Symmetry: D2
Subunit: 318 residues, 4 copies
């Protein structure tokens, strides 16, 4: 029996016996994603080049922003594109807070590399007039999170308390088809992913770990290397093939480079629900209590046995 | 003045004042690429999942094969998917020979990583009955070559004697729109791309070069690292952002992993026409005279100053 | 504030405070319509013609609606022009709704690329017995929802419920039905009459006189314009948008008409009434006819109120 | 062997051994039709309705106009949209003249009725400066003509000296697939098409003919009636199913309502090449020598036996 994202979310929402808000929120996000996908695949670019005589990131942000506001399910929106959290006007407020990167990897879009949309959904915990403070909850409080990968094909990975599910976007009918139910990452992988250009600045623990991947002390087979540069792409490969992904702090970016609210937490949540791990080295990413909506955070995630191995090396250096 | 691949190829073909065969050949390939793109983006996948109640590689190979045969411009077809060269039936023979990888990076199409179609076109030099021998020409003989990148968006890079041009596929109207005329790679880049998992088996020259990229002896800024795993994707980034791409040889692989006829030469051709370089370490990729249609060849390509620097290190170890 | 069919139905469903079944049913139907639309516009036809080196559209359309409805868990009895007998949903997928539909109306003529569509009518099962064909035998007046999908120059879904009629345009770029017409109402009177005049020789005197009054206004007004696509979905939609009258009456050879009551007449009748129009068989409101056979025929005259009313006056003159 | 509009036109053009202009013109028209089709099916309408926070006929006219001008194959363009013929700037002139209706039936598009694009191509005869005079040639001089039907599916019917061919537009890959070679209309049909609302003003000949279709002389079965209102739709059904289409001159418009240059001639040309007929009642539509680019002309076309029958009745009343 075929299943779509819409049908899936409707059912899960019905079971929850709530207001139906989250269902509306996700429906809206889904529509936005479809819109972004169309734009990312360059639909209509011929008109831009004069067949008949705004930047992608901006448009993407506008789509998510507008669809979420018009859902009546949110009150506070935090986006990679905006400096301050956006407070939904009173007549359209809902109980959810959403953090997202409308178009991840958009900086290197020129080369047509994969790009994506990452999102994390929280329930407003505070009772004060909505404000940026409502977005400062530890990832552990996420009600739902996931991403949309705009690669060879467009896929939306949705993670909720009940697990992780993958939907393929069928461009023929603009419908997200469920193709992977209750997904689980491999216990251990054979791929490590990180920008080794920072080798000169790596922390000793990271240096040793990578070393153990290239020169297994047990003469096992060396891990293969892959690094697309687009977090959505790299994390998704990790989920599918297993392995490990890293963007640790550089002595140049002491607090890591990736953002906690809309890049780290969402991926961390997806990994954990899929049976994987996500650490900053010192603690689980999901446990970090944010103080600034755009704060950075180091992150090592992927197959449990792999993350655990890194942690062993991390401790050896602490 | 908007320009499409069809219009462009028709005009360049008209100027050549020939049979018009190459024009037909490229038109055919173009249609095939659009077909592949549709399939790659999962159009119709809902039917595969029972909405109404087997492989991409094979389908892609069938599309290029049939479109090329039906163009009446080819006589010998060499495909990464086929063990032997395909000899076009007599009643559909043309004067061109085409070598191609219908779906490059397909081994990893499961994580939705970018994939592409690489192609190289030669003119049959002999009148002997068409045979695999006609595909054994040095890349320097290429009449045209390029690739189709199925990434965030689908793009077709076409290189001919007159230069390199990039066309973006507008899904809305199924038309390839010219968006980059007479492209030229940067003289020097800041990105190095290769699977460092093979570090343990690297040739000393490769090891030292990568080391100079991570720890510049002149204390310059270290190069950034990127490696998608899909040649089309990696080479295209190199073209767009500049830098260097490597898939070198070592003791266990005296001649590399990538294939000369349909992976190395096409990319080598594109690079040279764009002002870049492509070496095997011992000589220009395009100068290698093939003896086997599926023979492998080591390859280092990209920005000239970068390839030249590699060659300096290579020589140091020779 | 942009609005989509999915958002709209979810909202209306939430307000109803029910099981959420109808919401799932409509979502499913909507997905099916998108699928049919894709097929109707010939997506992938290149493969059928050997680009790489395959059933009829009506069949496929029927399969899509059938499967999407069954898989919704909101239905128990499905009636389609395609199947002779009502389909009883297996026990593990039963819902409380009954659906009558024509998966691809006008399909008898898709070779000329004429407009085609999907008509649907939704009823609530009103029995405590094992689901059967009998549950589809309710007068149109019992409809909970009904409408159609028009596959014309663009694909549009007209949805009529107790709260009114709303039109959604299908944006192929994102596969989303965008609300472009809220609480639609047909014109009080139109200037277009639609029917196959080829059957002139067999027309009922009332029909003959009426058409005559449209071509030669007695009060010397301007004669009505004529339009007849042949595809009910197309002709009814034009009537809705431009007003006027549409007819497929009974004749000598066809005493009860040609169109089907359950999935062609009732749905359209329901849509017209909710939009302020009328739908009569000549003897009574289409919606009031109590069916006895799921595939029974019924004559139908529908459209602008003043126009249907005028026909009725002529009909009575001949009774 | 699959065949596309592009491949077909390139081959026929090559055989003609000419400048290649007509090939470029048709390619351009083809791309424009795809663009119009996308617009007609409402692609992107969501943005029009604020998903992210000009008229179809105008856009359609702009697309054809620009694509034709940029083909370098035209010099004089006549469109229903413009009052005066458009003279192509000197630096983009070709030897062809094109008359067209960018979006036929656009007046009643609000009901989603079928719409289409009609076109007629002539070769500039004269040697003087291009002017409106160059579009005043009898249909008999057409080099090519046809239309694009935007119905349940988009189809382009192309008629040239070698016959009539039909191409289905595959939205998945934006390619026109040849699905009907050297088409021929039925010798006689069973459908008559015309707006009977004008009954009160019909010419006696028309009245009698219609009468013979509803109450058959040879005891035969009455013809079925169909009238969409969109010429492109009605003419296409006639071509496919055979029969007759009429828009005669009543008492009011003594010259008919349809336009000769871009509505009647193109259709007339298509019919004749398909073995059908097209008369004004007094003479073959293609034989009428125009004096005004927007002049009207009565027209009765379709199956030969049907047109012939009309003519017999027409003469009885003359
Ligand atoms: O937002 P509400 O409708 O008040 C509650 O919705 C939920 C409460 C708990 C768990 C889930 C949902 C929910 N809504 C849609 S999917 C899903 C999973
Ligand atoms: O195949 P022919 O028409 O005989 C020769 O075509 C060419 C000969 C030389 C250079 C070019 C072409 C050609 N054909 C299409 S683009 C292009 C560039
Ligand atoms: O199927 P139920 O959820 O039990 C009842 O649904 C309804 C009951 C009355 C009115 C409406 C709906 C409904 N469901 C979706 S839109 C809409 C309008
Ligand atoms: O415009 P030219 O290439 O100089 C002449 O083209 C033709 C001359 C006669 C007949 C045909 C063509 C032509 N060009 C494309 S299809 C087709 C049929």
């Amino acid at each position: 029996d075929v299943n779509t994202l819409t049908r899936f979310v409707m059912e899960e929402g019905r079971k929850a016996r709530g207001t139906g808000e989250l269902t509306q929120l996700l429906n809206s996000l889904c529509t936005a994603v479809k819109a972004i996908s169309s734009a990312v695949r360059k639909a209509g670019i011929a008109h831009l080049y004069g067949i008949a005589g705004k930047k992608l990131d901006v448009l993407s942000n506008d789509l998510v922003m507008n669809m979420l506001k018009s859902s009546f399910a949110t009150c506070v929106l935090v986006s990679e594109e905006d400096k301050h959290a956006i407070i939904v006007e009173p007549e359209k407020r809902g109980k959810y807070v959403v953090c997202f990167d409308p178009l991840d990897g958009s900086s290197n879009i020129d080369c047509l590399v994969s790009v994506g949309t990452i999102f994390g959904i929280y329930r407003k915990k505070s009772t004060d007039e909505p404000s940026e403070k409502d977005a400062l909850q530890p990832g552990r409080n996420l009600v739902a999170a996931g991403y949309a990968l705009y690669g060879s094909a467009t896929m939306l990975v949705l993670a909720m308390d009940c697990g992780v599910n993958c939907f393929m976007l069928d461009p023929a009918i603009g419908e997200f088809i469920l193709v992977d139910k209750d997904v689980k990452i491999k216990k251990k992988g054979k791929i490590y992913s990180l920008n080794e250009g920072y080798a000169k600045d790596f922390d000793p623990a990271v240096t040793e770990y990578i070393q153990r991947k290239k020169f297994p002390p047990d003469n096992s087979a060396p891990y293969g290397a892959r690094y697309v540069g687009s977090m959505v792409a790299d994390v998704h490969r990790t989920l599918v093939y297993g392995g490990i992904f890293l963007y640790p702090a550089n002595k140049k970016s002491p607090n890591g480079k990736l953002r906690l609210l809309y890049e780290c937490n969402p991926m961390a949540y997806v990994m954990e629900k899929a049976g994987g791990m996500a650490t900053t080295g010192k603690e689980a990413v999901l446990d970090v209590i944010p103080t600034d909506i755009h704060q950075r955070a180091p992150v090592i995630l992927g197959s449990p046995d792999d993350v655990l191995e890194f942690l062993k090396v991390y401790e050896k250096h602490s």
